[PDB]
Design a protein around this ligand. Structure first.
Ligand SMILES: Nc1ccn([C@H]2CC[C@@H](COP(=O)(O)OP(=O)(O)OP(=O)(O)O)O2)c(=O)n1
Ligand SMILES: [Mg+2]
Ligand SMILES: [Mn+2]
Ligand SMILES: [Mn+2]
Ligand SMILES: [Mn+2]
Ligand SMILES: [Mn+2]
Ligand SMILES: [Mn+2]
Length: 539
DNA sequence: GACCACGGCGCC
DNA sequence: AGGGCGCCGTGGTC
């Protein structure tokens, strides 16, 4: 390319280099743009950001987040990564996409700008004629990247002092548990080491091994194994409690307060848009899509996510999301009718596994039922179900037969999905998002059947993801108009922040947008709560 | 210091 | 014979 002075013309492709992957934390080391057979390199990258009207190129959203951090409204536009990801969701990195579609991802801005330009041309070519993939790009992914940039740059408020205090209390309890485990083992060892624990449990103590690990075939010490051994030795329950507390302390309580951004005073995640096989988003650095919620200590941690003074959090969560999507994809009349009588399958399953009335099923009971319903739906074995329910194998067998007898059109849909997947080599969501699943014709049964479960899950999980993304795209401009913020997405949940005087109106509006995003054969229902913290906003 | 594979486990 | 993720500490290499 011909070396040309900064700035570039309108519509140029940008290339940029960051000191680290997280745009809220990165130093912008270099900035370039490419167009019309020219490459333009910015003398000073921060100042040069001001000259761009749009971030167009590889990883556009990341540059847009950095610009928002610097007080500049630089929206992301075309990004070859999104084109590649729609062609084949195994396209998740610029390294791989470059090598596959006509270049090399280097560490130089100018080369990255030229690359973005060439990859865009090639990928746009590959997508001509792919009308539904093009619809997803224009109507969902490209616009969504702008929404995600705003969410990332906004961040969420955290009660840091609360978590610091919590760390000291939890440390004391961890010490109590550790001391008691060591007393029982007859000696201290590294309780965090599953290898040392394995020897203590199965060699030193007399305990029976229950299962083996996948890659190396060691005797497993997983929670499932431990729970099966709960009454074989007092040391077991102590280890399970130690595991719960250290998991929560090491993963959330200790690291999160250290991640508060000095300028915003808030916590900023990344919403990765080309990271999953199904079309879901993911969240990283830190992951805010797996904040605890199940145990009492977990709930204590979730309470640390709070609204700005004068604002409230609004949490919206699709009810029985994937079951409703299944109803639409399959057309089962019984399952559809369930959602037209306002029945709740999670509640009904919970009343059965706990042997209590439906009105006796509490939130945490109902939640327990989710792993069971989704577990059985996507191919859980009777043996496994037997083990998690602690019921005779024959009992698990009958629950799984009855589960599918009730909704007969579902198995039909599964078989149709698998057949089409074998023939075309990919499966697809309601909107035509594809996942290639080559192992559908593997000659090894375990491999083939794993592939099958992946394959028939994807249209369901991925259609739900398509709907959530579309809803975010529709909802965001309404929130901006009302002076509200979108903070987090958690697969089928959104967390918003609204001024107190407007929170009720925001909640009502957001609920309507989400419920009416794309009318299906069954209603999509949304549960919404408002609160000063994330936990109380879902209570 | 970075990076890896693994087991393990937090959420959806 | 649940699916989809990302992060932790260990054990380890470079
Ligand atoms: N153990 C789980 C939990 C969730 N999911 C998927 C399917 C549902 C989707 C959304 O998660 P939830 O909100 O927790 O499930 P829900 O059916 O929508 O339950 P709820 O009515 O309480 O929101 O994520 C799953 O595959 N396996
Ligand atoms: Mg949810
Ligand atoms: Mn904007
Ligand atoms: Mn104390
Ligand atoms: Mn839900
Ligand atoms: Mn692993
Ligand atoms: Mn799983």
């Amino acid at each position: 390319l011909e070396e040309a002075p900064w700035p570039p013309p309108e519509g140029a492709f940008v290339g940029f280099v960051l000191s680290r992957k997280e745009p809220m934390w990165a130093d912008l080391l270099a900035l370039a743009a490419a167009r019309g057979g020219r490459v333009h390199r910015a003398p000073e990258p921060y100042k040069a950001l001001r000259d761009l009207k749009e971030a167009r190129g590889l990883l556009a959203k990341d540059l847009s987040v950095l610009a928002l951090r610097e007080g500049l409204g630089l929206p992301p536009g075309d990004d070859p990564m999104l084109l590649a990801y729609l062609l084949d969701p195994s396209n998740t990195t610029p390294e791989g996409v470059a090598r596959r579609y006509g270049g090399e991802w280097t560490e130089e801005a100018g080369e990255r700008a030229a690359l973005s330009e060439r990859l865009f041309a090639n990928l746009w070519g590959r997508l001509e004629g792919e009308e539904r993939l093009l619809w997803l790009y224009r109507e969902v992914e490209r616009p969504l990247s702008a929404v995600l940039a705003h969410m990332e740059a906004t961040g969420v408020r955290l009660d840091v002092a609360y978590l610091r205090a919590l760390s000291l209390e939890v440390a004391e309890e961890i010490a109590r548990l550790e001391a008691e485990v060591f007393r029982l083992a007859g000696h201290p060892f590294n309780l965090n080491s599953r290898d040392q624990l394995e020897r203590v449990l199965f060699d030193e103590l007399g305990l029976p091994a229950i299962g083996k690990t996948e890659k190396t075939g060691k005797r497993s010490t997983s929670a499932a194994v431990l729970e099966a051994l709960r009454e074989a030795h007092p040391i077991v329950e102590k280890i399970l409690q130690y595991r719960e507390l250290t998991k929560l302390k090491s993963t959330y309580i200790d690291p999160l307060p250290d991640l508060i951004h000095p300028r915003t005073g808030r916590l900023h995640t990344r919403f990765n848009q080309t990271a999953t096989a199904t079309g879901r988003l993911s969240s990283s650095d830190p992951n805010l899509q797996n904040i605890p919620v199940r145990t009492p200590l977990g709930q204590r941690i979730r309470r640390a996510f709070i609204a700005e003074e004068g604002w409230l959090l609004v949490a919206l969560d699709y009810s029985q999301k994937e079951l409703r999507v299944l109803a639409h994809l399959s057309g089962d009349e019984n399952l559809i009718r369930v959602f037209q009588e306002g029945r709740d399958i999670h509640t009904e399953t919970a009343s059965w596994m706990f042997g209590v009335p439906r009105e006796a099923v509490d939130p945490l009971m109902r939640r327990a039922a989710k792993t069971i319903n989704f577990g059985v739906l996507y191919g859980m074995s009777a043996h496994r179900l037997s083990q998690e329910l602690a019921i005779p194998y024959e009992e698990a067998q009958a629950f799984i037969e009855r589960y599918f007898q009730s909704f007969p059109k579902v198995r039909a849909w599964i078989e149709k999905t698998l057949e089409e997947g074998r023939r075309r080599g990919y499966v697809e969501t309601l909107f035509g998002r594809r996942r290639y699943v080559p192992d559908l014709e593997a000659r090894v049964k375990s491999v083939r059947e794993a592939a099958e479960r992946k394959a028939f899950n994807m249209p369901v999980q991925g259609t739900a993801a398509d709907l959530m993304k579309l809803a975010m795209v529709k909802l965001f401009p309404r929130l901006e108009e009302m002076g509200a913020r979108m903070l987090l997405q958690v697969h089928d949940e959104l967390v918003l922040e609204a001024p107190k005087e407007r929170a009720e109106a925001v909640a009502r509006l957001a609920k309507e947008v989400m419920e009416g995003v794309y009318p299906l054969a069954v209603p999509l229902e949304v549960e919404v709560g408002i609160g000063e913290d994330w936990l109380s906003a879902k209570e």
